[PDB]
């Protein structure tokens, strides 16, 4: 249905050897398609998906220019932030940036995002209305005033509601076979006794795309959060995801328990029983 | 596609 394009930028200052390390990644939903690494011998925006390889050399030359300008600005902002927080040169610090857009099933703009961090803490963010900023601390207020004076929110909105949505729309058409797909999870259940009176029931979900999934254990049709372990959704490595949820049940009561699997790739949510 | 310029703090 609805789709998203996100860009994740990381800049880490190296007080030791050389200028800061800059890493940039691009996602279309849960699929990576572009990458830029300052340490890599390439020094260009590199393709990570087969459908992005159909873009012209002007696209790759443009995207590289943007990444060089992104890294140099990040290198300058690392120094600016050191002064703002009154920190020494010997310490290693990080700048993280997130921006992108959401489109509906029809391809219409839904949401635009612009968020910045310093040392994994909120610094400055553009609000949902895309007109105002949210400054986390006193140091961020200095940045906010500078950006209000230069009308930065309007320039960010023009990108988010323009080239960002236009780019995402193009990528979704170019990569329909892989991006519009809904790979359902391959569900199975394991039973392992810990004693003669206790047993572990584990419900699996493998090979699914997108990553969004719900695994809920029930006892007599009532949600079971107690005596349950739900691991974080993890990448399999082939563009697909994995997740499991286990519950410790008394021996003989196995059939009172059900696992409910919700995924957009499933026509009806599954109900598994041992 | 990505932004052309990044703003200074």
């Amino acid at each position: 249905g609805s789709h998203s394009m996100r860009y994740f930028f990381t800049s880490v200052s190296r007080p030791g050897r050389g200028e800061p390390r800059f890493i940039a990644v691009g996602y279309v939903d849960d699929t990576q398609f572009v990458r830029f690494d300052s340490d890599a011998a390439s020094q260009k925006m590199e393709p990570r998906a087969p459908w992005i390889e159909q873009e012209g050399p002007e696209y790759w030359d443009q995207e590289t220019r943007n990444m060089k300008a992104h890294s140099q600005t990040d290198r300058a902002n690392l120094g600016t932030l050191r002064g703002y927080y009154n920190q020494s040169e010997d310490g290693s610090h990080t700048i993280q940036i997130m921006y992108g857009c959401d489109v509906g099933p029809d391809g219409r703009f839904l949401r635009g995002y612009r968020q910045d961090a310093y040392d994994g803490k909120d610094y400055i963010a553009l609000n949902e209305d895309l007109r105002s900023w949210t400054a986390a601390d006193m140091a961020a207020q200095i940045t906010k005033r500078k950006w209000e004076a230069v009308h930065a929110a309007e320039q960010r909105r023009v990108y988010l509601e323009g080239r960002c949505v236009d780019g995402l729309r193009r990528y979704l058409e170019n990569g329909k076979e892989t991006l519009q797909r809904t790979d359902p999870p391959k569900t199975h259940m394991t039973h392992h006794p810990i004693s003669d009176h206790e047993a572990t029931l584990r419900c699996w979900a493998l090979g699914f795309y997108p990553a969004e999934i719900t695994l809920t254990w029930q006892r007599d049709g009532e949600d079971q959060t107690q005596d349950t372990e739900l691991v974080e959704t993890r990448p399999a490595g082939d563009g697909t995801f994995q997740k499991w949820a286990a519950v410790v049940v008394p021996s003989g009561e196995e059939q009172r328990y059900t696992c409910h699997v919700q995924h957009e790739g499933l026509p009806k949510p599954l109900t598994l029983r041992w | 596609c990505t932004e052309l310029k990044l703003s200074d703090y």
């Binding site: 890493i23 990644v25 990080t94 997130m98 961090a117 994994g120 993890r234 399999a236 | -």
Partner: protein, 100 residues
């Protein structure tokens, strides 16, 4: 200042068929800073053909990486993953379990 300790997950790409070619994965997530040391061991010894995904992050800003290597599971060889981070006083070793 706030530093986040990583979450670690050792697993295989496909359900492990003892004697059949596969990939050994180590997913590290929820950590800050990005500077991490992730090794994959075969009976306590580090494998050298280990690769890793491009550094990315969550909405809460914490970083995540996938480390992977070619491996052939058997019901005798012990596989684990060594993870070192500034939040960890000593490297953490999490052993691989197929039969979850």
């Amino acid at each position: 200042m706030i530093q986040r300790t990583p979450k670690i997950q050792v697993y295989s790409r496909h359900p492990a068929e003892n004697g059949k070619s596969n990939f050994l994965n180590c997913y590290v997530s929820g950590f800050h800073p990005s500077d991490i040391e992730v090794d994959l061991l075969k009976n306590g010894e580090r494998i050298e053909k280990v690769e890793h995904s491009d550094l990315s992050f969550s909405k809460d800003w914490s970083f995540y990486l996938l480390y992977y290597t070619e491996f052939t599971p058997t019901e005798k060889d012990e596989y684990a993953c060594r993870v070192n981070h500034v939040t960890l006083s000593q490297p953490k070793i999490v052993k691989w379990d197929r039969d979850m």
